[PDB]
Amino acid sequence: NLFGEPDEGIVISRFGMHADVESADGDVHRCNIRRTIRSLVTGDRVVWRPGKPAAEGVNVKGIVEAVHERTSVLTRPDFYDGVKPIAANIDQIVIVSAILPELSLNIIDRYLVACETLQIEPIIVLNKIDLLDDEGMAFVNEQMDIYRNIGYRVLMVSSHTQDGLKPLEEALTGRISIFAGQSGVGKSSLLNALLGLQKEILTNDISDNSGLGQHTTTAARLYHFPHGGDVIDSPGVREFGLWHLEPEQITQGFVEFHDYLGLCKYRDCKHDTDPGCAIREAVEEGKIAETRFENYHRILESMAQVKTRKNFS
Amino acid sequence: SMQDPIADMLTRIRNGQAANKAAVTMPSSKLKVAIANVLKEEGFIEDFKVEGDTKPELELTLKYFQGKAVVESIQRVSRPGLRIYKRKDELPKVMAGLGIAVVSTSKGVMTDRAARQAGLGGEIICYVA
Amino acid sequence: ATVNQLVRKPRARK
RNA sequence: UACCCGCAGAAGAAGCACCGGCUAACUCCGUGCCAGCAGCCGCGGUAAUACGGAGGGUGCAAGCGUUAAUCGGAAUUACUGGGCGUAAAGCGCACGCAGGCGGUUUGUUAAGUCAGAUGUGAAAUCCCCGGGCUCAACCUGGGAACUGCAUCUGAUACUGGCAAGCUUGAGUCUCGUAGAGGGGGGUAGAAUUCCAGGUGUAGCGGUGAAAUGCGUAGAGAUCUGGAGGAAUACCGGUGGCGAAGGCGGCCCCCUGGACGAAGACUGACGCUCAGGUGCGAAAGCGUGGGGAGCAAACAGGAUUAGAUACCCUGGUAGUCCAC
RNA sequence: UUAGCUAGUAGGUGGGGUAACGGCUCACCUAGGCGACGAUCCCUAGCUGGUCUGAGAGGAUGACCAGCCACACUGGAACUGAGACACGGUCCAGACUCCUACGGGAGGCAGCAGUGGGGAAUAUUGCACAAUGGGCGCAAGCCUGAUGCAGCCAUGCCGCG
């Protein structure tokens, strides 16, 4: 009670019982939330009041009263958790991965399907590239050229080498960015090489396994670019929520497969067991690599196994 | 084991009274005769006989109403683990004076009704309820 | 339960 | 001074808490899970007797509420008067000292107990009948109470001690019967794997499906022969034995308890157990052996979003023996 | 979640000692004493007649009244005297404050009130020897913050308007 000025400010982070709210000038001021708030995410502009200082100059918290409308939203469902938004109000996401512990391609494909339902442009960025040889580097560069023909920009960097950071920053200013990826793919180290942030905490960095990666850093912490825009860190995520829509939207989740629709035999097509699929003819021609097509029906067969029990929002 | 033989005597009475037995037998002693003869003189049982001199065997004749237990319940009060003694004016009654309390004194085994004219106290044996 | 047990140690009042 | 006479006129002299239930009393408006309320239960987001106010009432009273503290309720540390198969709780089991307890008959001691009496338990407080201050509170007369302790005289049924016993308790002998009871030393035959030889050819192996792995140096399969290791099919069953964990090829040796029959014999020699004492599944630890099979960690292949687990091919510690 | 404790310690002789017995004290002699029925160590506490609660058994506590023990700024010691190791007696040391001419001395409200301070919180810097009890004296008489009273504090009980 005894609240202050209603104003607009940016929420830094989410902590359940309370939240960190940046004001209109750069003041870290933690506040709790209103009971009728259905959800509050990282980087959401809100209406809030900074309480009242009990001691003169020493206040504890304020409150966050109301939540503005969403520009974007990142809704990913989960078994026995429901549909939960992670972050919101963003224009660009940067898919960040590393060659260690693994570099999969199925982790790439379903963020592409999600961003086709959010009108966001994801960017493929690889880390830890200084550890390989040029024979190995040319193969990984060859596997990303397929991801270059489909229109997505690919910038391949290294944190301990500071390669390619300057072309990574020129396309990244003026926007907010999620550094999405799995556990231990170099998310925290690339935040250190771009920002120049306060080096006295500077992150929590524990990723040591036998052949795996660890998710030590929590959900999302907000900072600022030296030029403009905001950053959003991501959890180490190994989940895939495809409970949203019909498999017609799975066909829309891929860029180059748009221009090849309406060319097959029948008006409806499963594209795997149906005779005369023109999408399958494009893969056999070589204009589409067969790694994407075998992973394409793996997405559809994953909907034969996730759907089984039931889930609805 | 058989360390309280009076409590063993009360066990054999209470079982056969409830289980419709006509007559019961038990190992005799001097003190068991001095209790059953009092219960014979107080209308709770019928008769007792002695059998054997090298193994004294006491017998009790049961008593019923229409096949109903005359001795409804009986309660051992003092015991070898805890001795109970009262004076001539602290003698407890059973069912406010309906039941009798077997108290052995120097003038033999008698009731608290019989201890009024005797004016003595001692060891409480059982609450004949 | 046994009276002779309470000779060694009485009932511990909380 | 109390007391008392006389004066004037209701004149100088009533409030607080509660009102959903517990727990005595019901309607209305305002507010809108916000504010607040609250000892418990839990009330209030569009009709709240529960919030705020009003109306009216209830319970008390020159006091009324609240907070803190003690006991009661609470049989909720259960002597009166609780439980321990699954609600919290029977030590993993056994031996046994101290301690507690003890069959039956007689005598003795009167120890415990009981009867009587003396002395004592200061007064005040409490209780009984009174008296007094106008009443009550309060003060006070005597009695009772103070269930206590010490001593003397008694009674001997029970408990204790002594004495003599008795045999049903508990033990001892003989004749017997059953048993995977333990320890030690040999020994048998399948099966597993390794190795030697023979005949013999393209897959063996493994799974839901495959792959890792093995094999033309001839695997696998079969047969002969040998080596090592550990376990004992069938019998075999709410079957037996052991204090318990447990214990299983056969045979010998040493050794333990259990049970039955016929009598003879000692005469309560008994029950129980805090500390103490020993046994006590498997894992693991120390030293030195041993090594088939199985198999933490780990190697490798599938699975997968990832596989760390599952599945599969291998594989060390350990499983084996002594200490 | 304290199991061993203890050498004047346990006992004996003799000497000494106080009003009286006694390791109360001293030399010598013995090696015992205490203790799982709690020795010893640590913490806490004045105790009892009682009050309160409870049908009772039990339970919690010890203000006012009365009995006893201990204590009188801290520590130690002795004198005086029938009786003290002495609340308003002394001596020494330490602590604190006061007086001072700088060398020294003075003081003990846990007596009645009363101030400062602590704490949620507890009073007038009153009157009197009229009565009772005590002290001294042959008595008269004197003294008594004991006590008898008064005021403050709805602090409790009881009674009335």
Ligand SMILES: Nc1nc2c(ncn2[C@@H]2O[C@H](COP(=O)(O)OP(=O)(O)NP(=O)(O)O)[C@@H](O)[C@H]2O)c(=O)[nH]1
């Ligand atoms: N050699 C090398 N190491 C790198 C490079 N980038 C990052 N690392 C190392 O990779 C590790 C993982 O980095 P980190 O950013 O903590 O990973 P993360 O993805 O943030 N982990 P989390 O999922 O917990 O948030 C760190 O030890 C970091 O030093 C690189 O370019 N080269």
Ligand SMILES: [Mg+2]
């Ligand atoms: Mg990180």
Ligand SMILES: [Mg+2]
């Ligand atoms: Mg009512």
Ligand SMILES: [Mg+2]
């Ligand atoms: Mg109210």
Ligand SMILES: [Mg+2]
């Ligand atoms: Mg309303």
Ligand SMILES: [Mg+2]
């Ligand atoms: Mg009144």
Ligand SMILES: [Mg+2]
């Ligand atoms: Mg309380």
Ligand SMILES: [Mg+2]
């Ligand atoms: Mg109780």
Ligand SMILES: [Mg+2]
């Ligand atoms: Mg119970």
Ligand SMILES: [Mg+2]
């Ligand atoms: Mg249980």
Ligand SMILES: [Mg+2]
């Ligand atoms: Mg058992």
Ligand SMILES: [Mg+2]
């Ligand atoms: Mg008295």
Ligand SMILES: [Mg+2]
């Ligand atoms: Mg009197």
Ligand SMILES: [Mg+2]
């Ligand atoms: Mg009286």
Ligand SMILES: [Mg+2]
């Ligand atoms: Mg009267």
Ligand SMILES: [Mg+2]
């Ligand atoms: Mg074999």
